[PDB]
């Protein structure tokens, strides 16, 4: 009955308790479409007006028996309550219940609460509330008490199975209302007002929809159990390794030698307390807050003469960076695993514990930060992907049932108007307009800092004329087309907003001059990828708009919480985070700066702020707050990223509409041009015609037979490697190694001669055609020719001439010949070249988009970055004096050491705009630019501290748009391309050799024997008792617990531990070792000759042996010889007893299977990456061996040698701090450098570098590393998906 709409009455109640009487005297699930908050089924049709906001009968049969009723409203949404008397005090037919339930369902009620929430928030952000607020607060508490009582009146607090208490989100209502009551009267000091913040979480339920969003987020975090277990496991193991190796190496400090007045280190260290004091005794590199790390090794940093290495003192970075104890080791491995500012960790550990420990950081940065982040990404994506399919499978199901159930139930102005509308002829006038657009943007792109007067004049007048054209086109159209329909179209809508703003400036924001650039986006009609970008952005405020909003409210909550907890602390507790005793530049006193710190924590630069936080306001709360921010944000941001990205891949369309279905302007005007160009091609081309011996074949087979012989290929590869090493020996220390210099010079001739013979043989073998149609052969040909060009020149004595000299520098390309020989590298390069057409599209889109942002920047900031610093200290002179350039120059002419100096990467031009945006978008070097933008005043004016504070919003918007959305476009494109390729191959692996393929299939097959051998009970009784003893389900569990106890006994160690506790742990270790050996030999007893038939058992055996021998050898090496480093390296062998812990775990054994499964392809990509590193390192050693020691470049991290060059290149492979290395390369002219400086003992005379080649080198490297790493990422993620699909 679709008309089962009656009023809820008493005889119904006399009936509801009727059935229930005999149901309890005799001893179905509720409809999934009727629960509260949803919409009433259409089949029931319309609700009569006399029943709206009235109690209705509960139609659900499973709820039909129970004491309950349903309420519906104008929005057709279900409210279900219980018909018991309110608190057993007010029956459902009291009038007060009626009026109150009407006022409960009222939509203006929800609007009221939403508005109170928003005003509450806008007041939670005022740091220092004034007097009016205490009163407002009163009002707010009143409103929330009113909204609580309205529910609990009808809702109850009593248990009728339905109550105020049941529903979860009202628990928040209790906690807030009670906290309002307590503190208003009682009058923990740190966290007084925070719990108010929890009111703002009621946005989650007042605003509709977010409830499902949070539900799905908490569902996506459900599948992170295995991955987070593995992550903590791995970080703890690398913490044990780091703690073993570097315990206390960060406390090495360069100490004075001539200790005056007969004092030992002990006598002085106690009595030292000021930074200044320490400097009198330790060497602090100029202008740093921490004394220098040194080392007792050749490969370590070195102390200046007169200072000797000693481990006494605090640790660097306030004491927060150290491997001293397991806790700080775990924190340091975390900052590594998230690759946050590990530049300093890398450099500090390598400076203190010597440079050959790069290996550790290599193994972590690969197997940790890379792999663990990959794991998290993959599992989150899998879960969200299954969730999206869960929605879609319901989506067609719900649609299908409804359709079947529905089916089963069954004057002069007109002339001039049409004239101009014809003159709006589409195939022409639109293209003329888009040309006007492009000419405009490339005219505003000629903005640059030092402009001649006539140049700004011409720029002005050209803008004016272009605004004239666009405005005239707008009015043409408004008049001709029907006005009511002019505003109908979206582009028209955009364009009308833009033309208005244009006429606004023509009336004149200051910024808005920059907004003519939005008109670039019109090109989107005929440029499909920009259409894709616009759809991506549209899905941020569109369908996936709820997610964005959660993200917005979460960032707001963390901003307000951080402010409330730490805002005052950053104010009194500050003279310990800035020696001038002023607030630092990045803090949490206000709401804007809180917000900024929360934004940065999302961006992944979370530790410098954390040290300041911890120093200022305690270690427990800071850590918990930062760690909550990181995790919550990073899960939501990922979820947002993933949602958009999976919408891009296939849900955007199912080829429902063709590419530009209606005749596009690009597709019609070409025809009107096709009828033109062919008219050119047919008419004048006709008019100009109107007006006017076998022995060669034998030898060819011989040579061709030689070339494909295996010995030939091996020999050539051997020569390739020898040439490449000969390259590597040529560093600045080669003036010493004489005989090696001479041998290298002669070997040059030998390999040149070999490779020339190679190419000559190849010619005859293949002929100039086949040889010259192949790219690899062309490359080798170019390399051998440039080689022989160099040889001849040297002979002729024209070596001195520069082109030859600069052709030498191209010798670094000799490694390139290695590519075509190893197949694995060849197939990776083949794959990566396959994709480059799509990268071209996307790079052009990101390039034009950043161009818009870069012209915006040039209009805003250009030339305002100048400051007048003092060189001695390095400080901006205060703006009170040196007000402007002019008084900076009078100053310069009176005193010295002052230079009105630029930023060297700034917004003076558009090209520098691009460089600066790349620095900002990768989060490297971006802080100094932002810091200098927000100090801006005006050209020739001295910056003031945070004068235009709110320019940070420029960079905020830029990160969100140019970095976040563009990467989303890139990642999508790259994935489509790779799936496109895979499919074209037929789905096969795209990065593995044939061999690699067969071994991969085998090693996939190995993980498939679920069932094993019988292992029958052995004959003799007593050893049979041992058999069923060892094979007990719990004996292995006991071993596992013993291993966990072993793990904690390893964690207990710490720097500085007493001679007692060291030997206590020693015997605990040896009893553990004895016990493990005993359980092992027990295993051998049962499985006579059969212990070795399952691999894990061999693992246990070998771990036992390593464990025994490591303990013995440590004893021997401590007794006989003196050997700390060897001691600690062989002592870490005891970690083997941990690693068997994974054996029991079954969620970690599948992920490690996935890793080892994917290993081959990563080895291929690692080879390619090593080759690129190698070439780029040889170029480094050639070019920048003599740049001045400045920022990233220093004494041990430079390009003076293969060691140092390869170290810096590995560091910036993860794009860590490439701005630091680029900074000294950029300087080319005095006083930024010196081009006639004689480096002692060598002939190169230039201290400063070439900007142009410096930029090309570093930008290129970061891009190539990005692509190869993205390939790494695809490999890992694709395997994870594939191996989990079982």
């Amino acid at each position: 009955g679709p008309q089962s709409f009656v009023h809820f009455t008493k005889q119904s109640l006399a009936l509801i308790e009727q059935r229930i009487a005999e149901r309890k005297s005799k001893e179905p699930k509720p409809s999934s479409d009727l629960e509260a908050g949803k919409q009433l089924p259409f089949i029931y049709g319309d609700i009569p007006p006399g029943m709206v906001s009235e109690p209705l009968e509960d139609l659900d049969p499973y709820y039909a028996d129970k004491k309950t009723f349903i309420v519906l409203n104008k929005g057709k949404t279900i409210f279900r309550f219980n018909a018991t008397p309110a608190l057993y005090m007010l029956s459902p037919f009291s009038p007060l219940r009626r009026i109150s339930i009407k006022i409960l369902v009222h939509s203006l009620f929800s609007m009221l609460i939403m508005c109170t929430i928003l005003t509450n928030c806008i007041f939670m952000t005022m740091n220092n509330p004034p007097d009016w607020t205490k009163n407002v607060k009163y009002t707010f508490t009143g409103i929330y008490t009113f909204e609580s009582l309205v529910k609990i009146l009808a809702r109850g607090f009593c248990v009728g199975e339905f109550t105020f208490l049941r529903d979860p989100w009202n628990w928040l209502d209790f906690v807030v209302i009670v906290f309002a009551y307590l503190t208003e009267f009682v009058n923990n000091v740190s966290a007084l007002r925070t719990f108010r913040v929890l009111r703002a979480l009621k946005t989650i339920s007042v605003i509709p929809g977010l409830k499902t969003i949070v539900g799905a987020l908490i569902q996506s975090v459900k599948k992170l159990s295995d991955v987070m277990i593995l992550t903590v496991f791995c970080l703890s193991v690398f913490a044990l390794i780091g703690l073993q190796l570097f315990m206390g190496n960060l406390k090495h400090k360069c100490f004075r030698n001539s200790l005056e007045n007969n004092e030992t280190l002990e006598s002085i260290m106690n009595t030292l307390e000021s930074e200044e004091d320490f400097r009198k005794y330790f060497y602090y590199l100029e202008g740093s807050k921490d004394a220098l790390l040194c080392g007792f090794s050749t490969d370590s940093g070195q102390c200046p003469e007169g200072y000797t290495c000693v481990k006494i003192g605090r640790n660097p970075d306030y004491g927060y960076t150290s491997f001293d104890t397991f806790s700080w080791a775990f924190l340091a491995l975390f900052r590594l695993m998230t690759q946050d500012y590990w530049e300093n960790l890398y450099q500090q550990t390598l400076r203190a514990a010597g440079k050959t420990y790069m290996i550790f950081f290599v193994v972590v940065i690969f197997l940790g930060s890379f792999y663990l982040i990959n794991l998290i990404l993959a599992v989150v994506a899998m879960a969200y992907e299954e969730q999206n399919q869960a929605n879609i499978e319901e989506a067609k199901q719900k649609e299908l049932e409804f359709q079947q159930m529905l089916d089963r139930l069954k004057p002069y102005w007109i002339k001039f108007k049409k004239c101009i509308y014809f003159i709006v002829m589409d195939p022409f006038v639109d293209l003329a307009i888009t040309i006007c657009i492009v000419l405009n943007t490339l005219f505003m792109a000629m903005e640059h800092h030092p402009m001649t007067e006539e140049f700004k004049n011409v720029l002005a007048i050209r803008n004016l004329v272009f605004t004239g054209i666009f405005a005239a086109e707008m009015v043409l159209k408004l008049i001709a087309m029907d006005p009511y329909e002019y505003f109908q179209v979206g582009w028209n809508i955009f364009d009308s907003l833009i033309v208005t703003l244009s006429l606004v400036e023509l009336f004149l924001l200051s910024v808005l001059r920059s907004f003519r650039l939005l008109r670039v986006f019109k090109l989107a009609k005929s440029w499909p990828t920009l259409n894709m970008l616009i759809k991506i952005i549209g899905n941020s405020v569109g369908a996936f708009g709820n997610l964005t909003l959660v993200l917005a409210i979460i960032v707001f909550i963390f901003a307000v919480v951080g402010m409330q907890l730490f805002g005052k602390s950053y104010k009194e507790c500050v003279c310990k985070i800035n020696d001038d005793c002023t607030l630092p530049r990045w803090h949490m006193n206000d709401f804007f700066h809180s917000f900024l710190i929360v934004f940065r924590v999302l961006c992944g630069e979370w530790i410098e702020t954390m040290w300041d936080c911890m120093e200022v306001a305690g270690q427990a709360m800071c850590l918990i707050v930062y760690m909550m921010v990181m995790v919550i944000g990073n899960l939501v941001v990922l979820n947002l990223f993933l949602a958009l990205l999976l919408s891009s891949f296939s849900s955007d369309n199912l080829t429902a509409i063709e590419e530009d279905p209606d005749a596009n302007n690009l597709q019609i005007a070409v025809t009107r041009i096709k009828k033109g160009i062919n008219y050119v091609k047919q008419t004048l081309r006709e008019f100009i015609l109107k007006a006017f011996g076998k022995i060669w074949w034998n030898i060819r087979k011989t040579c061709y037979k030689i070339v494909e012989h295996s010995w030939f290929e091996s020999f050539i590869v051997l020569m390739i490697l020898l040439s490449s090493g000969a390259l590597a020996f040529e560093d600045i220390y080669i003036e010493r190694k004489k005989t090696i210099k001479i041998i290298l010079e002669y070997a040059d001739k030998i390999f040149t001669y070999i490779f020339i013979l190679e190419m000559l043989l190849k010619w005859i073998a293949y002929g100039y055609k086949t040889y010259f149609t192949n790219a690899w052969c062309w490359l080798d040909f170019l390399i051998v020719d440039v080689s022989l060009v160099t040889l001849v020149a040297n002979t002729l004595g024209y070596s001195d001439l520069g082109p030859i000299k600069s052709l030498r520098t191209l010798r670094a390309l000799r490694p390139l010949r290695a590519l075509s020989r190893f197949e694995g590298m060849r197939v990776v390069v083949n794959a990566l070249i396959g994709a480059i057409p799509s990268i071209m599209n996307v790079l052009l889109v990101c390039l034009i988009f950043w161009l818009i942002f870069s012209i915006m920047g040039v209009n805003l900031f250009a030339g305002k970055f100048y400051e007048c610093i003092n060189t001695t200290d390095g400080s901006r002179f205060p703006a009170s004096q040196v007000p402007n350039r002019s008084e900076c120059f009078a100053l310069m002419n009176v005193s010295q050491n002052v230079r009105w100096k630029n930023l060297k990467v700034n917004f003076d031009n558009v090209g520098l705009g691009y460089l600066s945006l790349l620095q900002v978008a990768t989060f490297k070097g971006w802080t100094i630019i932002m810091y200098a933008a927000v100090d801006s005043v005006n050209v020739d004016k001295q910056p003031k501290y945070e004068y235009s504070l709110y320019m940070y919003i420029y960079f905020v918007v830029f990160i969100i748009f140019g970095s976040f959305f563009t990467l989303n476009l890139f990642i999508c494109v790259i994935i489509d391309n790779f799936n496109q390729q895979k499919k074209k191959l037929g789905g096969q692996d795209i990065f593995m050799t044939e061999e690699q393929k067969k071994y991969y299939n085998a090693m996939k097959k190995l993980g498939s024997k679920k069932p094993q051998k019988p292992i029958p009970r052995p004959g003799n009784k007593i050893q049979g008792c041992i058999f069923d003893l060892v094979t007990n389900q719990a004996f292995d569990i006991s071993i596992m617990v013993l291993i966990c106890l072993n793990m904690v006994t390893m964690m207990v160690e710490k720097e500085g531990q007493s001679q007692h506790m060291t030997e206590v742990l020693y015997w605990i270790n040896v009893v553990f070792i004895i016990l493990f050996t005993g359980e092992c030999v027990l295993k051998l007893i049962s499985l006579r000759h059969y212990y070795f038939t399952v691999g894990w058992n061999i693992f246990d055996f070998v771990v036992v042996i390593i464990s025994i021998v490591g303990m013995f050898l440590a004893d021997l090496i401590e007794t006989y010889f003196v050997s700390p480093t060897l001691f600690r390296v062989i002592r870490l062998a005891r970690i083997g007893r941990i690693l068997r812990l994974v054996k029991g775990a079954k969620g970690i054994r599948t992920l490690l299977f996935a890793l080892m499964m994917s290993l081959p392809a990563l080895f291929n990509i690692g080879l390619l990456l090593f080759l690129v590193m190698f070439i780029y390192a040889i170029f480094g050693m050639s070019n920048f061996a003599y740049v001045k020691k400045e920022d990233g470049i220093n004494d041990m991290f430079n390009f003076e040698t293969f060691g140092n060059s390869m170290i810096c290149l590995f560091q910036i492979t993860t794009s860590a701090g490439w701005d630091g290395l680029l900074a000294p390369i950029l300087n080319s002219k005095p006083p930024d450098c010196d081009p006639k400086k004689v480096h002692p003992g060598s002939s190169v005379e230039g201290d400063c570098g070439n900007p142009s080649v410096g930029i090309f080198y570093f930008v290129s490297y970061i891009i190539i590393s990005f692509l190869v790493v993205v390939n790494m990422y695809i490999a890992v993620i694709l395997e994870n998906f594939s191996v989990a699909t079982e």
Partner: protein
């Protein structure tokens, strides 16, 4: 540097008077700069007078009518600089001042206490 002091102090005549000056300074108090300035004044019009201080060690100037009755009874390290008044008389009724400067925190603290004597 907030100063926690009782604004009004009533102590029985001839009894012991606890006059608590305290502060919450986030910086570790170090004796080589931290200073305590202990002054008192009777009527607002009449002049302020100093009786105790702390530059390097606790200094008592041993004043007339303040002689042999005042000794420091707190310890600066735990932010307690309370002093005692032995066997109060009707005379010491007045307004007591504790001035604290705790470098490197710039803000100069200030506590005020009104001491009244009941017969």
């Amino acid at each position: 540097m907030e100063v926690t002091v009782p604004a009004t102090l009533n102590v029985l005549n001839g009894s012991d008077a606890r006059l608590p000056c305290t502060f919450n300074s986030c910086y570790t108090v170090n004796h080589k700069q931290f200073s305590l300035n202990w002054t008192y004044q009777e009527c607002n019009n009449c002049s302020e007078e100093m009786f105790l201080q702390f530059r390097m060690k606790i200094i008592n100037l041993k004043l007339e009518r303040f002689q042999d009755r005042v000794e420091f009874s707190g310890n600066p390290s735990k932010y307690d600089v309370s002093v005692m008044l032995r066997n109060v008389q009707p005379e010491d009724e007045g307004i007591y001042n504790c001035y604290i400067m705790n470098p490197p925190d710039r803000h100069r603290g200030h506590g005020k206490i009104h001491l009244q004597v009941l017969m």
